[PDB]
Amino acid sequence: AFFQQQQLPAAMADTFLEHLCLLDIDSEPVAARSTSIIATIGPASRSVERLKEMIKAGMNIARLNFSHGSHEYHAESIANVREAVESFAGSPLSYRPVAIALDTKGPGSGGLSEQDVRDLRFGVEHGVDIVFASFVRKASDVAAVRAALGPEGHGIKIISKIENHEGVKRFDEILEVSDGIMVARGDLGIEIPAEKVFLAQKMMIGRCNLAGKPVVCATQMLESMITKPRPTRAETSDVANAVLDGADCIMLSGETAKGNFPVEAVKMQHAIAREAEAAVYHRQLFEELRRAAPLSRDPTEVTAIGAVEAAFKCCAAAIIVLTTTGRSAQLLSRYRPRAAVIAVTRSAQAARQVHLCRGVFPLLYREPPEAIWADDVDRRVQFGIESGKLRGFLRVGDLVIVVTGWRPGSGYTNIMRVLSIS
Amino acid sequence: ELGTAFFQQQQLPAAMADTFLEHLCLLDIDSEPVAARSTSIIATIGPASRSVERLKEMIKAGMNIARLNFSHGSHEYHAESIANVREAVESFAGSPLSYRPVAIALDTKGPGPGLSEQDVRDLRFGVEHGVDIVFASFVRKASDVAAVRAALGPEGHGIKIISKIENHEGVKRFDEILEVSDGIMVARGDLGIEIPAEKVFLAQKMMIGRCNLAGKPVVCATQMLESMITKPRPTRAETSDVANAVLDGADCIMLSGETAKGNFPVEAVKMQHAIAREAEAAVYHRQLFEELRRAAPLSRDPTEVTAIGAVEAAFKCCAAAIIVLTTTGRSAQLLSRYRPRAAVIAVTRSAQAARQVHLCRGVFPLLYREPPEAIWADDVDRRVQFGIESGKLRGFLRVGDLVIVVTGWRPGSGYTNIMRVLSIS
Amino acid sequence: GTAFFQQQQLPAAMADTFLEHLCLLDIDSEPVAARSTSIIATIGPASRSVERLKEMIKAGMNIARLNFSHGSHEYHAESIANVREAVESFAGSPLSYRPVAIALDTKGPGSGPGLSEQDVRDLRFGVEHGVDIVFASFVRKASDVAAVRAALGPEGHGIKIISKIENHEGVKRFDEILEVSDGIMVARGDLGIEIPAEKVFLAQKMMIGRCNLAGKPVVCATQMLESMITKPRPTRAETSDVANAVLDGADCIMLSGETAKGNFPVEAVKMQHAIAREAEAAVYHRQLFEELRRAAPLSRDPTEVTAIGAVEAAFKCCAAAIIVLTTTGRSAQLLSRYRPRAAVIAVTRSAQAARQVHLCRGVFPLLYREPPEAIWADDVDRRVQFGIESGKLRGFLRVGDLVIVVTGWRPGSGYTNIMRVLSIS
Amino acid sequence: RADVAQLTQELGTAFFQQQQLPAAMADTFLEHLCLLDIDSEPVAARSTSIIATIGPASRSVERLKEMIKAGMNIARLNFSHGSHEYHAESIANVREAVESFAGSPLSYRPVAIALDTKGPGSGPGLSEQDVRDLRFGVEHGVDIVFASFVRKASDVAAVRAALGPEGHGIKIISKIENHEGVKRFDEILEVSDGIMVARGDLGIEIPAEKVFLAQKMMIGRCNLAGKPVVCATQMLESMITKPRPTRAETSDVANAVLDGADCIMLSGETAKGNFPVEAVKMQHAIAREAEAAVYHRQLFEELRRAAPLSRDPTEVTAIGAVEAAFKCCAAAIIVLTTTGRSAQLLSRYRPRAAVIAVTRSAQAARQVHLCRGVFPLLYREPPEAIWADDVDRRVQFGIESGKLRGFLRVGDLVIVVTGWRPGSGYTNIMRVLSIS
């Protein structure tokens, strides 16, 4: 029964043609949904009661669109998101962190606009986790956003939105200085011919996957759901194909900000993403990602490939990783393991930000400390196991890969262990 | 000899990539398509696309197959639609550069237990009016196809039956349905109501993959550019859906309400044409050809052997086209199954085969009407030169280009066994 | 039949990985194809008798090597006359006649920097006595090949020059040497003294790989069956060395003292024949064909385009042979470079091209003696039928087999452009 | 180039020109062959073990010391000739020569002793002489048995029974010497510790022109199973009387290594020939060149794809460690092992990195020479009070021995493989360490 579920016959295929021929509508997904959902906050999704239903439906990142709305309005949206998120903190083994992303208005007819400088300052003061920087055309645009975040915003992730021809042509220099990319198809589809957007999307997703940096697919994914309870056949296909392309995150704009079915739109993206993730051809994908990732003498990089290889060898249910900044979890995610990457961290911000990386499931550690560092490490790993069991990630008899480091502090991951559950 | 500009166009850097990851990384929005659009467009006829003048604009925009939906309208209404399509098509017989065969497909109302009485009468109407194809609704098993075949009677055995898979049973019994059908339609409208909406992409990708393996035409249908029923431009999800259906391996793409009742029928056809051309250049031929080659069983049929040799030869010289002589369309279909980048120019005397080969990706039909030469070898040579001169006129070929030419050793269907490499003079 | 798929290592040939290919090799799977790697036998006191040469031709000798390091011009002229008498003793049966090339192996430069005066005289003797090939000793750079070519004069333009790589400089300047040579000999005797003995296998494997990439003949030479100079059976290392030279990709394998002075010249030829046939069936064609196609550059030459299409077609139908008409041998050489499993039966009127094509693996030359027919298409057909009749008599072909026939559109060399699938009747 | 650009800047262009690294990074086997370079010098320690047959030319203690220095890893005693007294003296001379280097534990080289049986002769199974010789083997503490003329699984069960309860730790390598042994290979390999392709008798039992097919098939199946395979007979035959081998002989040695043989053997070349030490040196020189010429890119991919999914943590850790070693061009993989099994599971994936196996078992240290690329280090210190400290001291002993022997340099990355509790069978940890 195990080998019939999660498209495993299609996963074991010798060719991509045979992989397609073996896809089965009766093969049910088993793994947890790995592609994060970004939902735009607006009149349809601002109330605390509404935000609780959206978190339960699968929202991982709340996007604030600063093109419209005053600072007072956005501060109230942030407070409502935080109230809804913290209403589930009473059960630490099931608590789900939710990131807050600030999407800038943009340069308009201008580099960095004066309104963007003020909005980025607001973002730092209100503790936002991510910035979706609008209309990024070159590396100096990213440097300007970084400077506007100041010394207190050094930890905020900058996701550059590629929205025009120049952004596509200067993609490599933009990606190099950004934490990730958003394929902002709305403006891109007006700036370049509509029939070419899929080429830009597939190229940018491919280059982000090669670089091991998060990539978001955005705009009109389930557009008809703004007024209708069910999406079109093209919309479900678009969501599935964005996941198959390699997108780390998928996004909802008007569907959740102003539409009549915000919760249903989140549920639909969750249902499609789970089905599409099981349909990924891991046999060729892992081989290509492994071959393309450069040779490295960084122990975190070396441990990550060894751990993902070990996970595939034993059909591991999960890779449990201890991380301070999220980096060790991101390096595991870049190889696209089928095994869930359960990231145990004490940092509330890193727990929110790792939603940008496909297949990273953040767990915020709030248990009492242990006097012996090795005992504290073991307890965090056992916490990952208990949370995994409660959430359905793990069962007794499963094998897990555990990734830790040799000393406290970030940057010292160098150990991979094979553990039997219970 | 060809120049650096040649190797920058039609996504050729992405085509030469050693891995699918590098293929994706090399896709370029500035690399313009050069080849003729190979995925056929099926447009549904209705109030928005019925007039002769509107049909002429749709043919110019790229419509290859006209679909008549027998779920609505009387036999009198459909006979007038067929006459209007034929009048619009024949209005171009004056210009060789613009005249093109256009197939007529009858889409049945559907089943109740066996074939409905209305379907028996509509299938009989199809034979009497010389339709080329039947899109059989709600096919659930092999006996459903046999019943449609029997209803095509003594005169309509040459009509192609494309089975529409619209429910769970059709998906589960897919292999037995494909075995007795000429091709398949992924009818996503009903399929998306019969099975969970989030599973339709799996059924679409599986059926396209299995049809490509079998070398039989597959159509992707329904809501591809839905918003264009009321808006002049489609959504980002809609352009993506069209591009991904082509990348999946669909031979044809379809428009329903977009052309039957919408406010922008011609613009919907133009949009599908523009996207398909871009998506066809983005196909990863290096791995696709290797996999189609490896999956296709060994064969002692000379047409199949010649087809793989010709497609291999076309890739070796970057041939502009493969010119094939065919009576039934079969030699062109066997070339098409290997997905050559070269256009398959099919020269035929059969007006029906010329219309029907639009079901096969990359087959460009040329109807030949010259009287037969007394010496057979001279009649073969005249048809090959007809394909070359048409190719020159339409922009496929230029003097100095190489073309692959596929013919047989004796007259009649079933004897294709020769591949030649010709330099265009 | 099931028996067909058990023979010639076909289970190991269909394997998905090289590891599985090795695991499926079967000592009970008998070879079926004709032996494709040519055997070069050095002529000497043990092999000069006309009657002994007849037995060597029957055992499988394809090329007779005359080592100009020993013996006078008078001795070598008698060797040539003896070889020709033995070869022509079989000319009375044209369907079974086996051409045999004559190769002159030069003494070399000695302590000099380039072409020695003795080599100038020996090369002139070679042209005057009509030798087919020159094995040029100690080639160190491209100018060494040019000097050999100049010494052959205007009458020796058709002689093939095979450069012997025997030292470090030859290995380092390999690319420039191969570019101007017709082929290469891995001359392991001197190479194993000029560079460390433990590195010779790296030079052999590299040079064979580069010659296969270039589509030019490569010969493996020296001590392959050394112990057979005095013993009736070779060592385990010797049989392994012959098998591995064929698996590496050598077009020819050579015997020196084993046929020139030893007590078992006929047995040494028979042993190389037996090993080569076993090793050729153990070649992993699945990966080899894919790599040769991928590495071979795109081409606008119709002979090259026809060759890849024909080899692809032969693999698709398990063709027993590819019958090719050739004037210079070039059309057969372009088929051979893709390493088909199908035998390349080359029909030619050129007695010299018939001898020289033994340098290309899997090319079986047939010398056609009939004067040209009045109708060129009939002359072409008679030559193809001669290939079929010779193939049937020699065991290459049987009724029911499929063959690929490669011809051109007009008389004269350089116009090959047609591939045809034919059933043997 | 982007996949190796940062590491090329860090390690230098000279590093990437050595050990056939351009040929190793090739995208196809054809390009791999085209890039093989006679000027690309081997760097890694020789991984294919050399078995030398002991006889009149290689019996003295002084001659045995030179053979150990030349690279002999396993001493073969051919019980087809010589009395029990003759073989006991050969064993004593080998042990005296081996123990003459024990004074420096960081450089000591273990040497296995293998007993090669006379065989069944005209009989259907285990002969009476073999029963007595196998009992002698157990009484004299031999590490390995090369069982002659194995034709079926019951032949190996008979050898195992003749070793008795005290010989359970002895490795049985079945010699395949006839058609029946080749046909029943799968059942023989299943119950054996490894195989010897005994080409001398095989080449008389089956057509001589078919032996290469049997050799390549058996090496392939042993590599698939992760069990040692030995290539034997006439590899450097002419070196019995000549100081240099023929071109076919060097080719045969190189091709046995490229085929996948864990061990290569010398018979008359060391037992009775005039150049026993030179024969060992020649096999050492060819094996190092051939090991660098292995196409690891495809070999590793095929070994991973063919190896079935496993829930054994030693197997899972082994593949993770070999993958990690390739990622960073690790100089070595240090593994703690009691029986040799954790080192054998690393060896089956054919890492380019040397597998430095630290063990307290003197017998396991000798037996792991059967597995390609395993370098045994015999640890002689008594156990620490705290087990985690004892584990750490053994890892440091591997690093210190590695540095002293030239395997490891400051700045290198090493992969360390250990287990979660004492005793055999619990390997489950892989660590990446920087050498300081």
Ligand SMILES: O=S(=O)(NCc1ccc(S(=O)(=O)c2ccc(O)c(O)c2)cc1)c1ccc(O)c(O)c1
């Ligand atoms: O156009 S193809 O050659 N696409 C191959 C293909 C498609 C997908 C994958 S992936 O899923 O491993 C993958 C996804 C993203 C990556 O960044 C990556 O490195 C690998 C591999 C290969 C094709 C189409 C239809 C066919 O029926 C056919 O046989 C061949």
Ligand SMILES: O=S(=O)(NCc1ccc(S(=O)(=O)c2ccc(O)c(O)c2)cc1)c1ccc(O)c(O)c1
């Ligand atoms: O015959 S081939 O298709 N390949 C042989 C090949 C391919 C790969 C390797 S391995 O060294 O990775 C390897 C060795 C042993 C194994 O158990 C294994 O799993 C892999 C060796 C040899 C060939 C020959 C010559 C060519 O020039 C050409 O392009 C192709």
Ligand SMILES: O=P(O)(O)OC[C@H]1O[C@](O)(COP(=O)(O)O)[C@@H](O)[C@@H]1O
């Ligand atoms: O992913 P990051 O940010 O590098 O964090 C990984 C770090 O986490 C640890 O596993 C545990 O460290 P702490 O005890 O400081 O939380 C370290 O050993 C390792 O260096």
Ligand SMILES: O=P(O)(O)OC[C@H]1O[C@](O)(COP(=O)(O)O)[C@@H](O)[C@@H]1O
């Ligand atoms: O594709 P089909 O229907 O088999 O037709 C291919 C046939 O066309 C030809 O090329 C020409 O035949 P006709 O002259 O009868 O049209 C035949 O030699 C060949 O058998």
Ligand SMILES: O=P(O)(O)OC[C@H]1O[C@](O)(COP(=O)(O)O)[C@@H](O)[C@@H]1O
């Ligand atoms: O291989 P080559 O030397 O180019 O010879 C091939 C030539 O042989 C032919 O098939 C027959 O030519 P001939 O009639 O002159 O022998 C030509 O059509 C073709 O050009």
Ligand SMILES: O=P(O)(O)OC[C@H]1O[C@](O)(COP(=O)(O)O)[C@@H](O)[C@@H]1O
């Ligand atoms: O390779 P083997 O025989 O399984 O030995 C591996 C064993 O060695 C160890 O690393 C150390 O064990 P000991 O302390 O008993 O020597 C164990 O943790 C592990 O199970």
Ligand SMILES: O=C([O-])C(=O)[O-]
């Ligand atoms: O700004 C955006 O999100 C867009 O244009 O898609």
Ligand SMILES: O=C([O-])C(=O)[O-]
């Ligand atoms: O009938 C159709 O085309 C459908 O249901 O999609």
Ligand SMILES: O=C([O-])C(=O)[O-]
């Ligand atoms: O000259 C030769 O043939 C050699 O050195 O091998």
Ligand SMILES: O=C([O-])C(=O)[O-]
């Ligand atoms: O016994 C042996 O070693 C042989 O026959 O090779």
Ligand SMILES: [K+]
């Ligand atoms: K915005």
Ligand SMILES: [K+]
């Ligand atoms: K209908």
Ligand SMILES: [K+]
């Ligand atoms: K000579």
Ligand SMILES: [K+]
């Ligand atoms: K013995």
Ligand SMILES: [Mg+2]
């Ligand atoms: Mg925008």
Ligand SMILES: [Mg+2]
């Ligand atoms: Mg329907």
